[PDB]
């Protein structure tokens, strides 16, 4: 098909881990036969069947992963809603409304998948039709909006929006006397995945958001991997994990975090979660948290079994913050790429907010 957007051939920026130890070009080298325009789930999976061949898949309108048939149970949702994105693929949205609903985009390196670009698309978090009950935790949902796993590497997520959208948590029902949680994580990066860059994106209205590194049996294999760079993104009405990381090394700069500690649906808990062997370098980030005092600024970061966290130049509710005394160890590994961290002013925060998300490429 014809290439509508010339911007589709662009590779990841010089800044970011997705451009370290190799480049993330997606399907920039695709032949005309591997350039597609898809308007439904059938055309989407057909295009994806090109495998590792460089391919550019242009999304037009809303793609219903369920194909119009609601999932009847877990097995059904597992069998039909998880869409694998193969190596050397660029999934780019056309215009202002490229969207995915009722499913998950999976970047699974178990088959060697790498070099993937997901850009200018909106992904509504899936609703698990059959949450499983966990002894001591209650109902737990299984599916996320996007999952990077099993060693997938060199992934660039740009101008993407992930939101609970049409079904927010205040709409949850109850089953057997417990809140029937049907949303799981939003964006997960785990199991040895590496070299990822998340830019100009928006995650809006969601609880358990971004988990980098999962508590697995042989997690030591995550050591020295899961390097993720996040810049110019907006995390709005997100309860927690932006991200919560274990083993991975996160570089989060000039992002906007907006929430309310008394939000009636997505009550802000914290932004950065410092888990086992995880590290986070926060720079020039903007935190606008309603009902959060400057005296409790340390609440933007939460310590789990990890220790490494450093912040430089961030601001909370219009005033600069000093988190050096929050109880964490210094982030010392040197960032390998050149990057421009600007002072977090009211205007920068506004610009980031105005530009973040899908439909703004």
UniProtKB/Swiss-Prot annotation:
Q: Which residues form the active site?
A: 241
Q: Which Pfam families match?
A: Pectate_lyase_4
Localization, UniProt:
Secreted
Q: What's in the keyword line of the UniProt record?
A: Calcium, Disulfide bond, Lyase, Metal-binding, Repeat, Secreted, Signal
Known catalysed reaction(s)?
Answer: Eliminative cleavage of (1->4)-alpha-D-galacturonan to give oligosaccharides with 4-deoxy-alpha-D-galact-4-enuronosyl groups at their non-reducing ends
* GO CC term, one of those recorded: extracellular region
Task: Give the co-factor note.
Answer: Binds 1 Ca(2+) ion per subunit.
Instruction: Cite the annotated pathway.
Output: Glycan metabolism; pectin degradation; 2-dehydro-3-deoxy-D-gluconate from pectin: step 2/5
Q: Which cofactor does it need?
A: Ca(2+)
* EC annotation from Swiss-Prot or TrEMBL: 4.2.2.2
- Going by the record, the broad EC class of this enzyme is lyase
Query: Is ATP-binding among the key words of this record?
Result: no
What's the superkingdom here? Bacteria
User: What GO annotations for molecular function exist for this entry?
Assistant: metal ion binding; pectate lyase activity
Question: For binding Ca(2+), which residues are annotated in this chain's numbering?
Answer: 142, 144, 184, 188
S-S bridge residues: 298-326
InterPro entries membership: Pec_lyase, Pectin_lyas_fold, Pectin_lyase_fold/virulence, PEL
Record's PANTHER family?
Answer: PECTATE LYASE 18-RELATED, PECTATE LYASE 21-RELATED
The family note in this entry says: Belongs to the polysaccharide lyase 1 family. PLADES subfamily.
The entry's protein name is Pectate lyase A
Species assigned in the record: Dickeya chrysanthemi (Pectobacterium chrysanthemi)
Query: What taxonomic lineage is listed for the species of origin?
Result: Bacteria, Pseudomonadati, Pseudomonadota, Gammaproteobacteria, Enterobacterales
User: What gene is behind this protein?
Assistant: pelA
């Amino acid at each position: 098909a014809e290439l509508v957007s010339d911007k589709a051939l662009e590779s990841a920026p010089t800044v970011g881990w997705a451009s370290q130890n190799g480049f993330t070009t997606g399907g920039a080298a695709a032949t005309s036969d591997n350039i597609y325009i898809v308007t439904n789930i059938s055309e989407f999976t057909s295009a994806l069947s090109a495998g590792a061949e460089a391919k550019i898949i242009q999304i037009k309108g809303t793609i219903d992963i369920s194909g119009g048939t609601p999932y009847t149970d877990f097995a059904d949702q597992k069998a039909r809603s998880q869409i694998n994105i193969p190596a050397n693929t660029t999934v780019i949205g056309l215009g202002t409304d490229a969207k995915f609903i009722n499913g998950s985009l999976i970047i699974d390196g178990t088959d060697g998948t790498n070099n993937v670009i997901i850009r200018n698309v909106y992904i509504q978090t899936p609703i698990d039709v059959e949450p499983h009950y966990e002894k001591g935790d209650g109902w737990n949902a299984e599916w996320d909006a996007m999952n990077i796993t099993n060693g997938a590497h060199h992934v660039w997520i740009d101008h993407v929006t992930i939101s609970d959208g049409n079904f927010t948590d205040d709409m949850y029902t109850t089953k057997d006397g417990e809140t029937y949680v049907q949303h799981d994580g939003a964006l997960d990066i785990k199991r040895g995945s590496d070299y990822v860059t998340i830019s100009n994106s928006l995650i809006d209205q969601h609880d358990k958001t971004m988990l980098i590194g999962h508590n697995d049996t042989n997690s030591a294999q995550d050591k020295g991997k899961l390097h993720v760079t996040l810049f110019n993104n907006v995390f709005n009405r997100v309860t927690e994990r932006a991200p919560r990381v274990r083993y991975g090394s996160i570089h989060s700069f000039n992002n906007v975090f907006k929430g309310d500690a008394k939000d009636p649906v997505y009550r802000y808990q914290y932004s950065f979660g410092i888990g086992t062997s995880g590290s986070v370098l926060s720079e020039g980030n903007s935190f606008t948290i309603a009902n959060l005092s400057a005296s409790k600024a340390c609440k933007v970061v939460k310590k789990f079994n990890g220790s490494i966290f450093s912040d430089n130049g961030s601001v909370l509710n219009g005033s600069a913050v000093d988190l050096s005394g929050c109880g964490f160890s210094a982030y010392t590994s040197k960032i390998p790429y050149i990057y421009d961290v600007q002072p977090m002013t009211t205007e920068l925060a506004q610009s980031i907010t105005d530009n973040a998300g899908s439909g703004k490429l």
